[PDB]
Design a protein around this ligand. Structure first.
Ligand code: UMP
Ligand code: MG
Lengths: 224, 224
């Protein structure tokens, strides 16, 4: 059971929260969704757009008690936003010890921060493929590289990328106005482990919309 | 906590449930609203339209486990429906013993049935004022005459009416095509006692909309 305090109308739709708001065409900036959630430990929540491509995928963790915001890129002025709770997995097997690559987190936190393995100078519009020296050794849960809120707000956009085979890889693109430098060791993304796959997440696009289909392990929402 | 099992999108707005459906122009008929509720004992729920003049006010009582529906008159093809939880008051102080007028109820039921004092013959379009020989002795709680869902369906429409001072009175209108005859003793409306006012209820309208303003005591909804 997820607790939901809401200052504005919220639609519950196929297991996920749906909010209709009309941000401006500018970006990148934070679009308040009119609700707060209290996720139980072991849950996180994906925030993304319903049927459009101007929103960074966000991750709300179980310790977050502020208003939920969508962070959007420059785009068409109206938007619908989905929130999908994610049942977290404990870990995944890796050939290298897991915490020699990813940073330790709290049980309350959703994801494991990913330090940049090398300096990166992204000119405006520039993209780079970031690759980590670690492999998965089986397929018991799922794992996903997502951006970090701080970077998404700067228009430095990690492409939400699945990780089931090969090395941990993700694309990062600077949609900002100025060139950006990511220092080696800087926390540039996060790794989320899930009990159930996020089938739509492909790694090929900056702004993957969450599809309208309902989910399989739907939790309960309490509107208080 | 009220428990909602929703097979369709439901909007939580300012404490009410909001549903947008596309009923046909015809009336009278039941419009399914995509949800079932398990009200706790001592709760009812008002079903009415939000911003249109087409829908009879209904009462879902605590025992009802089927699909919540709205019973609409003939009219416009588009419609939004509010569901307003109602905290029942246990009784009201009256000048004559309550149960000499109002029929007794179960605790799972929401309203106390109102037997028609005399016979009414209602030509199509014709309304009448029923008056019951009982007065209130204090404003302890609120009291409202609503319709009964069986008569709403037949176009025989009780005007939702408040009962603060004077005698229990209510108007009842036959918006059907054919004359109707209400028999003496027949159960022709229902009386509903509430801890909080339904401030917009006037008695002078067949299809009062429920206004958009959020309620005083938002209850907890649990989607499951
Ligand atoms: O379309 C309808 C018709 C009837 N009921 C009912 C059966 C109960 O009579 C009713 C609540 O009114 P009371 O019985 O408490 O008065 O819930 C509904 O929920 N939806
Ligand atoms: Mg009824």
């Amino acid at each position: 059971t997820i607790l939901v305090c809401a200052s504005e109308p919220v639609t519950v739709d196929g297991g996920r929260l749906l909010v209709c708001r009309s941000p401006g065409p500018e970006g990148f900036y934070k679009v308040p969704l009119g609700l707060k959630v209290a996720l139980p430990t072991g849950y996180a929540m994906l925030v993304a757009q319903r049927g459009g491509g101007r929103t960074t995928n966000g991750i709300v963790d179980a310790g977050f008690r502020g208003e939920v915001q969508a962070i959007v890129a420059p785009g068409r002025p109206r938007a619908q936003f989905y929130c999908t709770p994610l049942r977290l997995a404990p870990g995944i097997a890796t050939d290298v010890p897991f915490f020699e690559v990813f940073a330790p987190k709290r049980d309350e936190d959703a994801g494991y921060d990913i330090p940049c393995p090398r300096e990166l100078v992204l000119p405006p519009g520039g993209a780079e493929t970031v690759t980590l020296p670690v492999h998965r050794t089986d397929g018991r849960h799922w794992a996903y590289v997502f951006g970090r809120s701080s970077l998404n707000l700067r228009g430095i956009v990690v492409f939400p990328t699945p990780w089931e085979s090969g090395p941990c890889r993700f694309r990062i693109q600077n949609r900002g106005a100025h060139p950006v430098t990511l220092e080696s060791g800087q926390r540039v993304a996060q790794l989320v482990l899930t009990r159930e796959p996020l089938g739509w997440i492909t790694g090929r696009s900056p702004f993957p919309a969450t599809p309208r289909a309902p989910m399989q392990h739907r939790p309960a929402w309490l509107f208080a």
